[PDB]
Amino acid sequence: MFFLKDLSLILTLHPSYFGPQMNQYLREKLLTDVEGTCTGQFGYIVTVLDGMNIDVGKGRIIPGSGSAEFEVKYRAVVWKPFKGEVVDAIVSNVSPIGFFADVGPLNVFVSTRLIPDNLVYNPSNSPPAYMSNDELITKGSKVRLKVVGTRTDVNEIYAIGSIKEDFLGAI
Template sequence: MLSYLESKLYADVEGTCSGQYGYIIAVVSILDIGKGMVLSGSGQAEFVIRYRAIVFKPFKGEVVDGVVNMVSKMGFFVSVGPVNVFVSQQLIHADMKYDPNSNPPSYASEDQIIEKDTKVRLQIVGTRVDTTEIFAIGSIKEDHLGVIE
């Protein structure tokens, strides 16, 4: 019974997003499995399980690394783990210009090019948390942010 509860916990919790804790990446350990309560009418049992987990919840001001997955005239999207971060054109260095004629589309300056699959370092400037997803806006306008090798 305990092994079933453990496997059910891993299957139901890992990879999900909760508004309070963020994305649950992995369950590290199970601290306690409470006594089961039989639900009236259905015969099912409900257990309270306390566990430790690795979570990811970006916050305002945090500097993170990610990979660009889409570039458009309005800005570009960066995958930072399970979170997609949008970097608006206004939050990109002034010397970087959008080049729609390049293939793939990109933002370019004299020494940097941002296109699909480019690794970038950015700062989170805002987040919005839904019950099942986290949305974020980022900036590469500050020093030491932008393309990384």
Template sequence: MFFLHNLERRVTLHPSYFGRNMHELVTTKLVKDVEGTCAGDYYIIAIMDTFDVSEGRILPGSGLAEFTVGYRAVVWRPFKGEVVDAIVDTVNQHGFFAKAGPLSLFVSSHLMPDEIQWDPTAAPPQFTNNADWVIEPGTHVRAKIIGLRTEVGEMWAIGSINGDFLGYAHAPERTSFKNHCNADNARNYRCLQA
């Protein structure tokens, strides 16, 4: 689930950057250091804004300046029971690994519907129901998180595709206005120039 969270972090700045635009440099360094990282039990997706940058304090012995920065960030905290869309990375006879954004997810073969079977003779090896489901690297799946494990800077999840509306998910179509307004569609529709 996504949240807007107020956070605080200490940022150090080298003396060569001291000058008029120090606060901008501190904010830029904060964004570079923090966005996309795992902070224990949540991921920092994006920094919305900084609302408090303290005056710099010179650190003895190094000459670096330390600033305390208060900022608002969009964070994602996965919960048990949350349903996520993921892309399959690797597949083996025990299950498959997938990525749901920054979260690594494992779905065991025991947590799949009974009609889904391992097919080692296929190229590449895959899970399939011999009809319309094929789970191989690059497949989009919808899984329910049933367990989470966190460590410093990393998070893993165990998921299940055994349930209603879970499992194989069609890849979202990526269409753009320019692709839609080609010569064939221009005869049938009024397309604007992009």
């Protein structure tokens, strides 16, 4: 599920920053605009590999003002959940409607309707949990879930899923 896709970015640069160590500023600004972004198109941009040899190529000077346009071509480590995909994360929260889990930079939520019936939502328990004929789930506990659907959002991609199939749940 984690990938290493070869992307690129464009940054306009004011003439001020036209010093001797410019390569440097573009690079550091690159990072400020990529590492931490999130598009349903490309997923979660989390880390830029091989910094050192980043590629800048010559940049062109926009005619009106003075800025230079650079097409920085790098490569980075990303992660974007797919439907039907199966992974497991640490349970993060938990209400009457289900519980949310955290797989990496993500948060997938499981509905009380997407669990095995014999596992009911615990009333006054701390921290609020779920009881099975044998199992018990809370914040801490580790769960392996299946991502049914995915909703692309702001600068975060959340999704939903169930543990109603087999080989899913606690471990």
